[PDB]
Amino acid sequence: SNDPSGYNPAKNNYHPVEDACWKPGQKVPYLAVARTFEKIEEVSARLRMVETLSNLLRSVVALSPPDLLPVLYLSLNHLGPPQQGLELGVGDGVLLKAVAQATGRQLESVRAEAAEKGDVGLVAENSQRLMLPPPPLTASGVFSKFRDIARLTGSASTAKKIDIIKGLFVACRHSEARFIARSLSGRLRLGLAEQSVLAALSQAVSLTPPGQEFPPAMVDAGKGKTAEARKTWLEEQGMILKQTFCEVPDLDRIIPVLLEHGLERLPEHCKLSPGIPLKPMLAHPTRGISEVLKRFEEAAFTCEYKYDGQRAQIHALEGGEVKIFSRNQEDNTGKYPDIISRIPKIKLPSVTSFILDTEAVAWDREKKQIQPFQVLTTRKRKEVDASEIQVQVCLYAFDLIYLNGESLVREPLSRRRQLLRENFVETEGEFVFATSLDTKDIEQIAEFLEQSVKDSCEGLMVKTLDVDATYEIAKRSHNWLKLKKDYLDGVGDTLDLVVIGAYLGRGKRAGRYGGFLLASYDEDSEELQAICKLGTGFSDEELEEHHQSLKALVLPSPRPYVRIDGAVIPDHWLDPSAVWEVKCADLSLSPIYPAARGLVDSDKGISLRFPRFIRVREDKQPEQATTSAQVACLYRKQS
């Protein structure tokens, strides 16, 4: 067969057998994957990306089915099922050390180029071999080497990781090192992620079904259909995969089934079950009540307090075992021994199994009061012993996904909410149903929004009760709406802050500034104090304007009246002059930023939660910026 360096999964009339660059039953070469990533990287149309990846996957299914699973994980840049918690434990620092060693270059040269180009991969492949090349990299080989890195732990493990990473680079050719480096830095940058990979996979197994005797008699099913019939058929097949995956987002479970039994029978084998994390329902932001009403204008809906904690998806298995997962399917069971011990107390005796959607919120037992998110994050994370817990939590339950052996994902929220209230028991400061309001009246919603904040919440979640009110993520992942005071114009906490530094952009921001350092004005000491960084809220056009206008203000050394304490040192110091209007959701007590240090806390300054750029204040000099005393005042009225 042809050399993988000429593989072209973007060609017209791609034939899964004739246009593959490996022989049947052979390991998929990693360069075939890298070539597919190149062709994905080169386009902006996502559906073209899907087709290109689909072509590779069709060849994998037709020629080397054992390599489908590693190829898929490589395309997602995942190490495996998220609940198993494999982590590379490799930062850009370590990665740049491996690159500098492999390329025979000095480290600072490598670091400077990586900062300039905003991509470690561009440094790895653009940099006299006394040794003949090692065996070519394979898709399954590379994937297992990533997992080897992830399993290395303990003192001296970074040295062993560098050894593995160097061995990969020495074996790379053409564009492989580019995507090895990008995978290790956690920034594959394809423009193609989970939904595109699902679409490519369902299309692949539909056009080129697995399990065929080789050579496969059916390599492009549905070519003879009308465009509309073909499109409808692929959507239906796509929905089978998506709905299975949202209930069982674990390719270790789905792929063996898919290859052995096929896509049509997949839902019979992979089913939602307690102990298997599933995808949570998400929410779209809204600009105000009017947008909520428009989006739900044909459906009765309920409003619920949006509690400020961490999502906890609680699984009670038949027999008594309890599992708790985060919103990203991480295993949090070892984090909440206290919650596990109180499960028997939240449910009626008749409840044998369930899956609950809850928010875990820090709770002050002496004051009987919700505590801020920053208190909740001080809980320990791994293998916590119940007696050691110092920050108690209260569960605010808002949905019920599974009850007594029966999935409720296809039931309307009216029924799910009714079953939650009927089968579970509230205990103040331990397990409580989310406060809710059923109405369409603007004024009642506005007052309820105001009350939620008074009762220590972020705002409101809005959910339809009967129309399109299911828990089917595959039909719409953002089926709920969120309404926060800081989404409203002319409302929320707005600050005028001084730009004192800029950071070189990465990825989509390469070649300009991707972020900025902002500061408030400390009247008392006559100093500007870093308060937060800022990297969102500007259009691409606005960001070009900033790059041009700020370029003229770059300083070699920091000004003596600018204090940053623990903040990341800017790549470019800027003459303090530009004043920007900046919005945030809350002010936080910061362990690094000096703004307003000593005005609220002896040792801590203040930063901004969810800061975003709004507009330039061309009418403002730096002396007219928000003062540090004003920052302290804003923080204090948060209560």
Added chain:
DNA sequence: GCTGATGCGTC
């Protein structure tokens, strides 16, 4: 062991 840095998670 001591110290500071930092990867990855939560939002």
Added chain:
DNA sequence: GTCGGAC
């Protein structure tokens, strides 16, 4: 988490 670009 927020946000804007591509479709």
Added chain:
DNA sequence: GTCCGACGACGCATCAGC
């Protein structure tokens, strides 16, 4: 709307230099 990847604060757990 959907999908994606730029970017934010911040804290536990754990890394290396010494």
